Structure formats: structure tokens, C-alpha cells
Write a protein that binds this DNA or RNA. Structure first.
Lengths: 101, 84, 60, 99, 203, 143, 128
RNA sequence: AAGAACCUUACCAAAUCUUGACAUCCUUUGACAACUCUAGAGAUAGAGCCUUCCCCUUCGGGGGACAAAGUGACAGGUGGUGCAUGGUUGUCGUCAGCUCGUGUCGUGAGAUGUUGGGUUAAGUCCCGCAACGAGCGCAACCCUUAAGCUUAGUUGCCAUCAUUAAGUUGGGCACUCUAAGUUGACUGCCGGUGACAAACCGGAGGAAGGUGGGGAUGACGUCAAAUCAUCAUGCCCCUUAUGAUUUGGGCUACACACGUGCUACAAUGGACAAUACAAAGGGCAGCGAAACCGCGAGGUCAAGCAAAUCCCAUAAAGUUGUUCUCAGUUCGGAUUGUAGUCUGCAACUCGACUACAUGAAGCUGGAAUCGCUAGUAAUCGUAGAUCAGCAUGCUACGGUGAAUACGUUC
């Protein structure tokens, strides 16, 4: 959703690519009101690839983060973090009922 | 509003009173922001620096809720996706 | 830009009001008093120097 | 029907000690002095922000004291005239002579 | 937070004003007129290693005294510069000003002299933690119960700024009656700006 | 943690009426709340010519439950409810069930309601019941 | 005659109470209180000093009050009177100070401060 | 950004320019120009015209300062790097912890102290404890407020007086109130309890009794947090320009979403008419007083004033009677256009405000979710900054005045 990126003009193939690959996770649970992404470029002089993202939640939020050479490998990391996140968050939880007295 | 009563830039006036006697000219590059209507500015056709460049108009009788401060809405198509 | 805005403000005008009074020391134009002609943060910057009363702090 | 003055100091004792030493000068050659009548000492404020760019909510307050201090004396002689205009220090006061 | 100098706090209660003059709503003229004097004394800050100065003005004249560490330097010798300096301030003050200089002792203890001392000799490419160690080693000497000596910038003329500080002794801050000293300096060799922070404790 | 005494009500030399005003005293405008309430007195003390304290103590005791419940997953327990919370309970179900009558005037619905439960009618006696139905339906799985 | 005196202060509303023995009859600055304070019919509680101390009464009233609106102004009445009865005789502190009446509850309106807008509430938060 | 028409505004346009818009160094040297004319969009120039060595000159110089020019450095860069930085700030969080010196034990990194019991707002305090002492930090410590005594009585007050429409006149400083120094609240004192001690509950007094109210204050470190666009500055780059003056646009456009907040969805209500109570600040050609004009905006002159004096000013909610009698309503006033006031030369894109009419959804909001432990929440107004003009914002002031706190399950 909210995407501001400094020192670069965004394009559209990255949009369908990244946001569709994020859409794959409605296995659990999406729940897709906000998804704030964040970037920047930063001379080292090897000189950057910032890949930072929020993926906020019902009653809570989150953070995944990464820096890379390149946006494809560097992105497969904003995903394959959130996956494991959402998964756990659902496991959880506590049902093993048990009468009382 | 105005405080009794209408005003004008007066350096344009020095132009119209000059071109007012003969067969009146109809070509003007000008500035025309703080200059409101009155019927000595007729016989003459106005192209006002719109914000980028000058832009003509045939002056015409019905010009009562109108003035030359601008008649080209300068937001320039539009700024908007839809039309009016 | 900045350096020549400094000269823009203090040279003459056409009439009364197309003119500003920013801060002397810093060039901070906005949110600045006319009492001392001193911006938001120049006074703090020179409040701690304690030249003037001045108080600092917390009774109101 | 007597001398009356107004003193404004930004340290809250000089009003009192200056008032009393000039009173001493005033009753030296004279008498009939009304005292340092207090006035409410109105204030000021400056709502300054603890920032440079943003974070407008984190701010703070400088202020000011503006005291007025009303002192008189009756039945002049030109030596208590000099009691006014003999000693003025500390001159942070806004001393104003009247009658 | 984060932190802030206590000289902002202890002032207004238990220390001086760094200037004075009587009261009326022409602060504008008086104020910035004074501020260039406060600049103009760079002439002697470059020349005497002084602490500071706080003025107090008369009805129609001006009284001043610079709190200085190098007395024979500021004096000239035979007052060979005192009267021309009256003229030069007066010249650029655009108003008469009666100089009356005042030396500072104990010796170079307080924030100012110590601060730009260590900054300058540090900008002589000095192994600074030793120089700091020497400053403290003559500071606890002179008598005060807590010193702490911080500095930042790209140190060693090298990569990213970090900041070292050698603390010492008892130097409370959250307290309110301390009457203490603080400074920050500015002087660079190669990379940017390297600034120090001084701290002491009197009584 | 203690509970903000009212000295008395200086009407009737009572206490309960003030405890009710403060629930009606919208905007802190006691003048208009004690207005509409005094109107309530003369009106209801006209209809079925009696006192407030009769229809008041009556109807406040007719809706007031002696049980209600609470959860703690969430298991809903029966408990003898404590008295002051039981008081403000009767007050609250009273007034909050009152305004929904679809009736114009400040007072008529109110007197309609206290007169309702005065004869063991009205939805606040009803909620008293359902509270006392869940309760003793709530004895099995929680008591 | 002999007018006892108590002086009450709540909510900017000073109560220079000129109590004097007699009948008991009100003049809020040369004016009865009943018409004066909106609306108001809470004057039973104002003769509380007579309600519980040397009960019933009465002593006659003159009073010079100013400041604030009626409420704290109608509360310096109490401390004015009761402080005037302890001034009359502290015999009945054991029925006054059992009702207080000398505790000028110094609560007031605190300063304004960041976040506070048209009515005093912490902000709303950003969401999702 | 505490006030985007111009300005600010840099972005866009063009008229122009280049030791320049702007400064320092070297010179001819000169006091630097007032007002007009020509054209111009202004910049400006042609200019006229009058700027015209003023401090001290013994004849010359010196010298504030020049007229533009010459002079080569130069100047400048909203041009970038908050990751090259300093400085400053939010942050967990006002969370209470974080450290050392000495001595020990450990092969060794390290631990010890900082742990055990109890207790506290808390490394608070105490008992014990190869440990002992300090450093930071908590509290006090500074402010402001409730109770108080004393000093000083106006422009403040009348308790005794007559006097005035009137605290106005004469009188008084008694009293509120007034700004400086004074105690009082420190588990201080009593009872119980407790490892007696630390310490908990209650009592007494007291105005305040449990770190009195609130603020000031943010330990070690985390966020390569924000900041070169506060300011300065390391490196790079421009320099007939990324630098500059000048006029005009525009930073405010809206198929869209979001966030933010303000306002109605009404009979406790709406509208009418009479009436009372606040605090706090500001004020010189600035606060504008009556009287006058008008539907109002506003304007006529000017009373008074560097202020406990004169003005902003009048308070609002409330209350008083009337009526409205549940509507898309006497709710709603969005909207659109008609007509006036004030501002600055200047209200088109783009200032509000004044009477006319028009009178939309909206009849309390789904799922969702946020603040708050009492003068709170909730609610009515006042004034200060910014200010030619401009606040559903912010700031400060007040006046009115609730439910809930079982228990820490979760």
C-alpha cells in the first residue's frame, strides 16, 4: 500500500510482482488493510539496496527488513520472513479444553 | 472588493489612450493582472501572460462577471484525470 | 535561493507589503516573532547563554 | 500630593533593598514616605518547541517576569529631590520620577 | 530528554546573567547591538583565551569586563591597546564604551579555557586520550569533585563518527544547586567537525 | 477507590434522587436535569396520586436484580451482585431502557417506566428476569 | 452589634463573610442569593453550619463575595461561615470537623498542556 | 510552515545579467543623489537632474565613504552526500536500573558486591551476606498552589462614616486582593502490627498525613531514528551557471483513497425576548470610549491609557417567560448566486466577514477501534503568538459538571 522511495522512481512490474507474491499468503490470513513498504539507496561505495517493510496486523504490527545487492533476491526476503511470522502468530493458540470444578 | 471605486494599472492606460484615436489596433502583449474592465480598453484585443506565455481573446459585449486578471484557468489540463 | 534572499528582504519594495522579516542570525523565515526578530530555535540557542531574563522554567 | 515612582526589576530583591536605601536617602532630609506597594507582577510566555524539524508536540516554555513597584513620599524638600536623583543603582529598574 | 546543559537550569535561580541592561521594549536595538560586540570580542578570544563576559549598562554609558585568563596579553603593556580598543568598539558599537578588564584564576579551570585548550592541541594531532588524561590529571589537582570529558566527530581522521568520554568523580546533574561549568568547541583537521564537552563541580 | 458521596439530595432530604440526577445530569447541566426531574415529580405525583418515594422505591426495587453474572476461555459465573453496583444497575437499565420508548417529552416515558415496573411489567423487570434465567441456567457450567 | 467573621476562598471566589447574630437572611453583595445563583434551589446545603452546628439557629448574614461562577462561590460560603463559627467559638469543631467545613479542597483547573484540544482528551491514534 | 494572492516560494514562464543579487582584499578616487521626463511587465536604463572629501589638514596627505569601473583571487550554489559529520531532538521511559575502586574465589574467561527475607512509588530502607566502600541514577533538591504570621496599602478594599448613578467625594487600610520573608506536613506524633529494626494499617491534631497538588528534571544504551532543507562543516560538483535581479503563474488543481479533526442528524431539544456570575493577557498612534449612520458588516470625530487607572469587553453555557409539538422538522446550513463591509495599489486562479434566497445528505452510524480513575471525562466561552489581510489549528485562561475502579481471571 503506502510506498515512498527515495533516490529512485518506482515502476509497475515491481508492483504486480511484489504485491502479488505478498498476496500468496492469504493461506494465513490477508487481512490486507495496510502494507507499508520503505526503501532508500546509500553509497558505501558498493552502495546499496534497502529493502524494508511493515506488514501490520489485527491488533498488532510487525517488521521485516533486508538489505541486498538486488531487488529480486532482496525481496524474496521481505516475503519469506512474513510467511513464518503470520504462520506462528496463528500457532498459537490454546484450546486443549479441560473441565474443572 | 474595492473602496469606492474601481482602479487600473495605468501603464496599460498609457497604451490604450495612445491606440484609441485611429482605426483601433487589436494586438496586445501585456501583463493584465491588476487591471479591471472599463470600456476604453475596447477596440483592442488582449493576450495576457497567462502564467507561462500570452494568450489572446476577442473582447466582446457580455463581459460583466469577467475581467482580464485571468481568463485562461491556469491549472493546465486540469490538473485531473476526469474533465469538468 | 538563500544567499540572495538575504539581499531580497533588505533591499527596497514596491509598496508596503511584499516583504518579510526573518531571523537575523539564522535565516529561519517561518514561525518567528517580531519582538526581537529571532526564530524558533535561535532563542533556545541563546537562551542557555542566559544573557537575559529569560526564565526558564516551569511555573505557569 | 507627593513624589511617586514605579520600579521594574527582573530580580526580586533589588526592588526591596534599592527601595529601602533610597528611602533612607528620602527620610534623611525628609519624612512622610509611603512604602513599596506591590503590584501583581504580570508575566509572559514563549511556547518553544524542543526540535528543529518536526516532533511539534515535544515543546517547552520560556517566560518572563514584569514587576511593578510603586513607591511615594510626601512633603518635598530639595534634598529629598536629591534623594530621588542621588542614588539609582542597581539601574535594572525602570525608574520613573513623578509627583 | 535526551539531555541538556544544566546551565540552562541553574540560571534564573543561582547564577548570573551573561549580560544586563535596564528595561524597555527596544530590545531589538540594544540586543543585536550587543551581539556584535559579543562577536567583535573574537579579536581577544583569538588572543587571550578568555572565559566569557557579561555586561551591565549605565544610564547613558556602558560598563563591561571580560573574564580573561591571559592578563598581560589583553592589557598590552602600557595600555598600548586599551584606548584604541575603546575607540574600535566605540567605532563599531557606534556608542561610547568604557573597558574595564578582569582576570580569571584557579588557573585555567572553568569550562571555556579547558575546552578550547584541548580542542586546539587535539587539532595539533595529539593523542587525545592522553591529553584528556592530563587535563583531568591537573583538574582533580586544582580541586573539584567531578569531571567528565566527552568528545565526538570522525576521530583519528578516519571513518564514521564515534565519541569517547572519560568520566570522573561526583558530578550530579538532576540536582539543582551545583554552580558548574559546561562548553562545546569546534575545530577540525581533516574530516568535518570534532567537538568536546567539559564538566566540573565547584561547591 | 471509594465512591464520591452525595451529602443529601436537598429535595426530599433524600440521597437516591441525586444518585439518579448524576446519571441524567448531561453536560453537567443539573439546572436542566433537575428541571426535567422536578417536572417528573409533579407529573407522576399527579398520575395515580401518590409520592415519588412510593413509585420510586417500588419501581427501583421491581427492576433491581439480586443476581447477575460475569465472564472469566470466557466462562460465565453466577454471583449475588453487590448492592451499590446493583443500585446503579437499576438506575442504568431504568434510564437506558427509558429513552428508547419513542416518546417526545423529557418525562412521560420515565414515569411510564417506573409505573411500568411498579406493576412488575416493563423490559427492565424483564432483563431482571433474564438475568435470573441465565442465572440458574448458569449454575451448571460455572457454579 | 457584633459581627463575627470568616473568609472563604474557592475557585477565584472569595467570600468575605460578615456573619452577625440575628435572624438569618441573605445578601450576596446587597442582593438575595435565591434569585441570583442559577437557578438555584440548593440553599438548604448552604445553611449547613446551622443544620449541624448550634442547630438550628440563627445568626444574620451580610456577605461580600466576588469571583468565579456560583459553585465554588457557593462553596466559600461554607468555609466562610464555619470558619466564622470556629471564630465564634471552636466548641463545635467536634461536629464541624466531623463534617470538615475547614478543608478548602484546593483542587482547581490544572494548566493546559500538549495534546489538549477543544475538550480535554488524549489524542486519537494512527491505525492499520 | 505560529498565518503559500504578490512576498514568503526556491518550482514554471519569460525581460535581463555575469568579480555578478552579495561581501573582503589592490586603485581613479569620491561624501554617497532628491524630484521629474522617455519607454518598460518591473528590472531598469537614456537621462536630465543635483549626489557633491562631511573627521582632521600648517597648503600635500590621512580618513567614515564613495561613482561605477578596473583589478585576480573571488563571491555564490534550496547542488548532493543526516551514512562522512558536529550541534539539537523523539524513542523504550520517567523504565530503575547501570557502573567503578579495593579485597577475594576462579587455571580461565568471569563472578562477588548488585544476590537471600521482608518492605517501598523505586538499587527505597533494613536483617543476613568475603565482602567493604563509593560513581551515575530514585527522593529531597527549583518552581507553582492549598492553611498561616509579619512587612508594604494603589490604579486595590470599604469594616465605621456622610457623599456619588457609582469606592466616586472627603475620610479608614480594617477586610479580599496585592509582591517579599516567615512557619506549617517532615510516618512528624500516638495506638496496633512486624525479625525487636526496616516497615504496613488506624488514630490524634491539621488546611494539608501518607514521595500533599501539579510541573521542572529523562541514568547506561537501542533505533547506521529525523536533520546538510536551522547553523556550521569532510568529500564531490556548478560558476556566463544549479549563481543572480525583474513581472506573471503556482506551491491551493481532484476520477481516488487515507489520516486528521469541526459541524448537524433536535423537543434536557429549536427560536424568540429579559437577566447574572469568569479568569488571563495586550495596548502609541496602538487599545478604540461614547454620541451618530445603517439589516449588519463596518465608518464620523474623538473620552481615556506605557496601565491593578482608559480601551480590547461583553462575557458565553446557565436562568427567565413565550412559542415550536417530532417532521428530513423553527433540526441541518452545506451548497449556488444576489447584494454590502474591512484589508493591502492588488480579493479571478487565491482573504475572510455582512443582509437575501436557495436548505443537500444526515433521524446517532455496520464490522472495526481509540481516551479516561474526579473538578476527571464531558461541556460554554475568553484572550496571546504568527498578523496589511487571514485559525474547524495551536497556545494560555477560565466557568459548568458524571458513571466506573470487584479482582489483576484474562
Amino acid at each position: 500500500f503506502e510506498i515512498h522511495g527515495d533516490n529512485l522512481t518506482i515502476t509497475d512490474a515491481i508492483r504486480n510482482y511484489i504485491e502479488e507474491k505478498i498476496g500468496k499468503l492469504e493461506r494465513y490470513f490477508n487481512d490486507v488493510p495496510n502494507a507499508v513498504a520503505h526503501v532508500k539507496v546509500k553509497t558505501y561505495s558498493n552502495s546499496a539496496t534497502k529493502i524494508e517493510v511493515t506488514i501490520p496486523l489485527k491488533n498488532v504490527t510487525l517488521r521485516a527488513e533486508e538489505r541486498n545487492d538486488d531487488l529480486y533476491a532482496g525481496i524474496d526476503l521481505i516475503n519469506n520472513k512474513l510467511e513464518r511470522q503470520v504462520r506462528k502468530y496463528k500457532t498459537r493458540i490454546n484450546r486443549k479444553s479441560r473441565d474443572r470444578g | 472588493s474595492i473602496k469606492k471605486g474601481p482602479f487600473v494599472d495605468e501603464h496599460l492606460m498609457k497604451k490604450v489612450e495612445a491606440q484609441e484615436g485611429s482605426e483601433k489596433k487589436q494586438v496586445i502583449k501585456t501583463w493584465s493582472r491588476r487591471s479591471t474592465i472599463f470600456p476604453n480598453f475596447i477596440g483592442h484585443t488582449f493576450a495576457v501572460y497567462d502564467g507561462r506565455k500570452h494568450v489572446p481573446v476577442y473582447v466582446t459585449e457580455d463581459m460583466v462577471g469577467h475581467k482580464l486578471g485571468e481568463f485562461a484557468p491556469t491549472r493546465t489540463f486540469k490538473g485531473h484525470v476526469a474533465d469538468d | 535561493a538563500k544567499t540572495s534572499m538575504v539581499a531580497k528582504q533588505q533591499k527596497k519594495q514596491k509598496y508596503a507589503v511584499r516583504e518579510y522579516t526573518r531571523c537575523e542570525r539564522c535565516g529561519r523565515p517561518h514561525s518567528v516573532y517580531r519582538k526581537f526578530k529571532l526564530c524558533r530555535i535561535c532563542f533556545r540557542e541563546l537562551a542557555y547563554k542566559g544573557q537575559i531574563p529569560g526564565v526558564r522554567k516551569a511555573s505557569w | 500630593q507627593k513624589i511617586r515612582i514605579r520600579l521594574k526589576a527582573y530580580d526580586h530583591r533589588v526592588i526591596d533593598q534599592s527601595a529601602e536605601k533610597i528611602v533612607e536617602t528620602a527620610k534623611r532630609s525628609g519624612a512622610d514616605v509611603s512604602g513599596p506597594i506591590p503590584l501583581p507582577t504580570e508575566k509572559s510566555v514563549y511556547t518553544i518547541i524542543r526540535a528543529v524539524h518536526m516532533y511539534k508536540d515535544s515543546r517547552e516554555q520560556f517566560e518572563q517576569r514584569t514587576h511593578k513597584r510603586l513607591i511615594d513620599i510626601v512633603n518635598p524638600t530639595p534634598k529629598t529631590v536629591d534623594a530621588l536623583m542621588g542614588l539609582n543603582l542597581p539601574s535594572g529598574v525602570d525608574i520613573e520620577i513623578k509627583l | 530528554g535526551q539531555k541538556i546543559n544544566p546551565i540552562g537550569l541553574r540560571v534564573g535561580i543561582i547564577r548570573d546573567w551573561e549580560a544586563k541592561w535596564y528595561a524597555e521594549k527596544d530590545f531589538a536595538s540594544l540586543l543585536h547591538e550587543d551581539l556584535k560586540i559579543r562577536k567583535f570580542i573574537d579579536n581577544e578570544l583569538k588572543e587571550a583565551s578568555v572565559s566569557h563576559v557579561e555586561i551591565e549598562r549605565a544610564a547613558n554609558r556602558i560598563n563591561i569586563a571580560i573574564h580573561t585568563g591571559k592578563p598581560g596579553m589583553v592589557i598590552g603593556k602600557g595600555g598600548s591597546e586599551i584606548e584604541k580598543l575603546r575607540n574600535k568598539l566605540n567605532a563599531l558599537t557606534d556608542k561610547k564604551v568604557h573597558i574595564n578588564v578582569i582576570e580569571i584564576k584557579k588557573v585555567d579551570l572553568d569550562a571555556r579555557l579547558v575546552a578550547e585548550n584541548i580542542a586546539r592541541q587535539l587539532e595539533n594531532r595529539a593523542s587525545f586520550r592522553r591529553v584528556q588524561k592530563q587535563a583531568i590529571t591537573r583538574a582533580m589537582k586544582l580541586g573539584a569533585k567531578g569531571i567528565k570529558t566527552q568528545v565526538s566527530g570522525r576521530l583519528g581522521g578516519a571513518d564514521i563518527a564515534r565519541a569517547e568520554q572519560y568520566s570522573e568523580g561526583t558530578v550530579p546533574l538532576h540536582t539543582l544547586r551545583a554552580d558548574i561549568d559546561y562548553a562545546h568547541a569546534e575545530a577540525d583537521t581533516t574530516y568535518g567537525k570534532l567537538g568536546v564537552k567539559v564538566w566540573i563541580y565547584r561547591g | 477507590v471509594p465512591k464520591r458521596d452525595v451529602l443529601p439530595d436537598p429535595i426530599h432530604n433524600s440521597k437516591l434522587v441525586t444518585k439518579l440526577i448524576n446519571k441524567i445530569m448531561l453536560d453537567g447541566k443539573r439546572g436542566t436535569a433537575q428541571r426535567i426531574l422536578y417536572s417528573a415529580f409533579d407529573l407522576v405525583e399527579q398520575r395515580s396520586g401518590r409520592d415519588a418515594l412510593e413509585v420510586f422505591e417500588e419501581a427501583i426495587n421491581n427492576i433491581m436484580p439480586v443476581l447477575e453474572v460475569k465472564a472469566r476461555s470466557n466462562y460465565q459465573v453466577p454471583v449475588e451482585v453487590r448492592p451499590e453496583r446493583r443500585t446503579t444497575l437499576g438506575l442504568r437499565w431504568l434510564v437506558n431502557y427509558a429513552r428508547l420508548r419513542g416518546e417526545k417529552t423529557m418525562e412521560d416515558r420515565l414515569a411510564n417506566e417506573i409505573l411500568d415496573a411498579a406493576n412488575n411489567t416493563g423490559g427492565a423487570v424483564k432483563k431482571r428476569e433474564d438475568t435470573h434465567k441465565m442465572a440458574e441456567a448458569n449454575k451448571a457450567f460455572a457454579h | 452589634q457584633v459581627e463575627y467573621r470568616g473568609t472563604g476562598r474557592r475557585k477565584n471566589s472569595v467570600a468575605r463573610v460578615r456573619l452577625v447574630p440575628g435572624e438569618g437572611n441573605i445578601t450576596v453583595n446587597n442582593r438575595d442569593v435565591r434569585e441570583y445563583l442559577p437557578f438555584e434551589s440548593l440553599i438548604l446545603d448552604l445553611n449547613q453550619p446551622f443544620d449541624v452546628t448550634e442547630t438550628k439557629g440563627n445568626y444574620d448574614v451580610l456577605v461580600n463575595v466576588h469571583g468565579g461562577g456560583f459553585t465554588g462561590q457557593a462553596q466559600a460560603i461554607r468555609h466562610g461561615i464555619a470558619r466564622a463559627l470556629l471564630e465564634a467559638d471552636p466548641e463545635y469543631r467536634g461536629s464541624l470537623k466531623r463534617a470538615g467545613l475547614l478543608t478548602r479542597d484546593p483542587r482547581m483547573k490544572e494548566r493546559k498542556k500538549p495534546g489538549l484540544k477543544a475538550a480535554r482528551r488524549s489524542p486519537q491514534f494512527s491505525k492499520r
